[PDB]
Amino acid sequence: MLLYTKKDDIYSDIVRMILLIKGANAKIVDVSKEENSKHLEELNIITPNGNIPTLSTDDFAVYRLSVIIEAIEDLYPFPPMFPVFPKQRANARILLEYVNKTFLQNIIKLQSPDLDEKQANEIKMLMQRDIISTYKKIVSEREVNAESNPDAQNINVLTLIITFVFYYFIKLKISIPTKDKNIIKEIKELLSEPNFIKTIK
Amino acid sequence: MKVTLYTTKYCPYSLRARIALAEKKMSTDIVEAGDLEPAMIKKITPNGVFPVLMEKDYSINNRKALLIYIDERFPAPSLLPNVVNERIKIRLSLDKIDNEWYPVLDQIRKHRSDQKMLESMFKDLKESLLAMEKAFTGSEFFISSGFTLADCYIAALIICLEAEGFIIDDEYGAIYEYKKRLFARDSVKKANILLKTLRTHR
Amino acid sequence: GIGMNTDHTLEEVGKQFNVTRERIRQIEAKALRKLKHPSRSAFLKTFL
DNA sequence: ATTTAGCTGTATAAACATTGTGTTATTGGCGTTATTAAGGTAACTTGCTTAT
DNA sequence: TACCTTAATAACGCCAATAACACAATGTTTATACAGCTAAAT
Ligand SMILES: Nc1nc2c(ncn2[C@@H]2O[C@H](COP(=O)(O)OP(=O)(O)O)[C@@H](OP(=O)(O)OP(=O)(O)O)[C@H]2O)c(=O)[nH]1
């Protein structure tokens, strides 16, 4: 029940938010901090590439954000981030995979300090262009999932991931090309959610 | 109700899907992509994915989640372990095979044009198999008490490699314990071709 | 199981806390005793 | 100052809590009996009815 | 406008396992008190 985390990492922040929703016992460990060099070395021995965030348990150790989220869902009977219906679950999984490949990889590449200006500009432009389409698809999927079950009291992981991507876009200082007041108000409401605030502060 | 699957010849994932359907024991219609008209073949998928599967109201062209969707749709004996810890470990093992298997098959298939280059790849592959030899021993199909989806994934690689003229049983290292057992399952034994021959072909 | 897809069993709930594996049944019994009081019980009695 | 009344403290007590343990119960499974379908049968009768 | 047979289909019986009841039992929780302490009193 220990999760290895690195500050300034989008995947690690998302995993921490998922644990906070669970409110489970999470012993966050920072690989970057020199306070725990020995623990980071133990993480390197356990994990070949030392991928972060890495969830560590006595029975097993797992790597990769999607695998970690699925394992957390199996471990906890707390409100689910996945739909009761299998077709809906498959669609949500495909949407999450597409969002991770299109935006998460670009964010990781931009994170490096050796970035070139042309590559950074092209990545930012592509992210701004696809952000509206991704948000529209997520809203449509959320509405379809809600129609099947009313008052399910189930939180959708994809909406949380979109909110985290928007927060990172704000932190990078990138500009969002939306002329719609409704979209801006909805994004602000998602940013104003109380559970999200605990990880952000 | 009625379910049909579209498959491409010599595709490892297509073979994996066929094996999963055979284990599920659900009757299905199998259609070769090549036989279909080319414009018609393009119409089903604009990108063009040979292994998708066919349903009246839904279509999936994603191989990564396709096996998981097939398992969830059918409540027949599962291909995933009941124990939560084993289920978590199996997914990580599947990710490990999927993340870096392009060099094993794609590079040899197209990159190794030279006969020596194919031979150079073969020696490295044999050494990697020997390193894997010091691994799970006596497992029925893998690190599980029951048949698992991951065992189905290995079958597709074994048939594809055999088609590549790289057959190892006693020369593949000490992995012979489970290789013979895997062929035992009826669904797995569908890789390749007086009354018996005709009845089998029917 | 309210808004819960799997209607999880006692073992799953005990694992969720990571403790109180048998304590969950006692907690559920205490909750049922508290809800069985007349102030809440009387209002819900009409439906049954 | 002195104590007195005030305050409930926390141990304890009691109640709960947790653990454990028993019980049982039901799914699965197997076989089982109800049921059932089809095949087969070959003197002879070889353009109909059916109708305000 | 027959039969049935055998066989088979489908019901049904029986039996594991078992999740859940159930109690147990404590160690906790709770409440308790009554008590030496404290606030106020004086
Ligand atoms: N830092 C970091 N990166 C992550 C994490 N999860 C996924 N990625 C990266 O995002 C990309 C998408 O991975 P997946 O969607 O899981 O796998 P896929 O490539 O088959 O789609 C991958 O790049 P890739 O080049 O395909 O990776 P690889 O599989 O080739 O190593 C992967 O390395 C994470 O938790 N942390």
Ligand SMILES: [Mg+2]
């Ligand atoms: Mg890849």
